[PDB]
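Bench log, entry 3. Co-assembly request; chain sequences pasted below exactly as received.
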Amino acid sequence: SDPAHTATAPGGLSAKAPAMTPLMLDTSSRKLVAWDGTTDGAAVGILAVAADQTSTTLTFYKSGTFRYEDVLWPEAASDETKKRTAFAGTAISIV
Amino acid sequence: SDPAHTATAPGGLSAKAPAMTPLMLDTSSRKLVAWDGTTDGAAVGILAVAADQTSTTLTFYKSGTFRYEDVLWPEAASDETKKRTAFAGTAISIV
Amino acid sequence: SDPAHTATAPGGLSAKAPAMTPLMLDTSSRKLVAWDGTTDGAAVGILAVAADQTSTTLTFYKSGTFRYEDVLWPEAASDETKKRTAFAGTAISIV
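Structure output for the full assembly:
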């Protein structure tokens, strides 16, 4: 049914991040960074391999269905519905 | 070919919506609602399972290729081109 | 591996475009046109069949993984990172 395809892109993480972390683009450099949890519609992917500020390239999921309880959401994303639709319009969804 | 993958998310419809209805996010709650046909780029999916105002979860297509004539476009979407590219950037397209 | 799915949409090119040309929506007509290389986040597809200003329909990739070296980026897209994440959030990625 729904394949979880991976992808790679330049990383600009501020700190170490585990797999299952939502990612967004930095608006200035357009590197992948952790989603802030507060910018609506900014999530673009889910980190697939743990990484940090030294990681030049990140490996991330660009498709699939992920359980709500399995994604390591940022604490600032305090609303369950906005998390559940954080990937709407991408090939990623939340169950 | 181009399988049509489904997804689920919280719903906030105000009226009955048959399958094949384009959906957008509500800008306040970020629940899935009917695409208004007037906010450019806001369509995120196509309802897969008929639903209504009591539906708490909507089941929607997040990929696939759909015939222009089969999608139940909102009437306020009066321009054919803008309908045909309403899903550009998503995994959905119109033929 | 990650299938590259095609799509069709109304085209609005003003010049010849070979296959592998990044595409964006025209913000007035919402026809598919060449990505300018400067509007951040506007790339929505990669042309799959060469086209020109006479083409009424463009045939494009809406998913897949493409090599950075194979995509025919516009000259104005001068920053490698911004090209590499030009499709983030779509079903397309760059390797």
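Chain C has one helix and seven strands. The interface with chain A takes residues 2, 40-41, 63, 65, 79, 81-82, 84-85, 88-91, 93-95 of chain C (CB under 8 Å).
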